Design an enzyme around this catalytic site. Sequence first.
Site, PDB file in Angstrom:
ATOM      1  CB  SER A  42      -0.911   0.543   1.333  1.00 21.80           C
ATOM      2  OG  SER A  42      -1.952  -0.748   0.352  1.00 21.80           O
ATOM      3  CB  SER A 102      -4.993   1.817   3.694  1.00 21.71           C
ATOM      4  OG  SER A 102      -4.001   0.677   3.282  1.00 21.71           O
ATOM      5  CD  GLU A 138      -4.611  -2.309  -3.275  1.00 22.19           C
ATOM      6  OE1 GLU A 138      -3.438  -1.217  -2.868  1.00 22.19           O
ATOM      7  OE2 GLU A 138      -4.413  -3.151  -3.166  1.00 22.19           O
TER       8      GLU A 138
END
Length: 260
Positions: A42, A102, A138
């Site tokens: 991240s 995040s 992601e």
Amino acid sequence: AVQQKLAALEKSSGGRLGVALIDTADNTQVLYRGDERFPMCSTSKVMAAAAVLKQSETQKQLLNQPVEIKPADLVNYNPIAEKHVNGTMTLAELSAAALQYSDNTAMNKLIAQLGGPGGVTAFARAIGDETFRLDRTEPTLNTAIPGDPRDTTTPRAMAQTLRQLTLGHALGETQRAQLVTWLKGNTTGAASIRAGLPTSWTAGDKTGSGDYGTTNDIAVIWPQGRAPLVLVTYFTQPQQNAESRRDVLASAARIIAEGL
Ligand SMILES: CN(C)Cc1cccc(C(=O)Nc2cccc(-c3nnn[nH]3)c2)c1
Ligand SMILES: CN(C)Cc1cccc(C(=O)Nc2cccc(-c3nnn[nH]3)c2)c1
């Protein structure tokens, strides 16, 4: 001294540690495995948010542009995006969610706005980072497989880039200030780099973690009295199911701070 200490930390740690400090007082560096590649996880969210900020320099209303959040867009960690499904979030909201919470769905929207993982890489190259590579979205960009070059950078390259973005002139002044404000309002970082710093110091940071017990943090730091520092701490372990070790990042940060 500091090199030895970082080595001893790493030996006890059960993994591989990478550190890069830039002290802007004199532009000196302290590196440990500074030119080895690590999975960013991240911490790559900083590059994505910055790339959108750069876009906003030539589209002044860009951060107010809405992006549709559909149920199918939700991935594995969506603390902010899940609230807005079947609605919209602006690119400002998405950047803030990606950086400060995040949020993985928010990151995916940033990547899409940039044209895919390679678009983020293209921005990195445009601001002089020849090392950074984003290859996937992601959540797969966090697989963190040893030896895999995908979605990696080196500590040296990430420190230089974070300096240019937050303290230098990679972004316009308004955009640089926005990025610093976002990092300073991070919610996820108190157990990582910042846990190893004197409490009087202030900082902004972006954490990251993945498989292989991968535990990362990059920070811009304002010591009490001294010029700002930029610090990258990356850590990764041999087994896929290894536990996170934020304490190792705090320890590395403590060694660096005591060595100034
Ligand atoms: C496929 N691409 C759409 C990916 C992408 C996305 C976001 C920003 C950039 C970029 O390089 N932006 C950039 C980099 C350096 C300078 C300037 C610039 N100069 N004048 N105004 N903006 C702009 C690239
Ligand atoms: C699903 N797997 C096939 C890929 C994988 C494996 C391990 C972790 C994640 C992940 O998304 N982790 C994650 C997701 C969102 C935020 C953070 C994070 N932020 N700061 N520290 N960790 C970490 C993904």
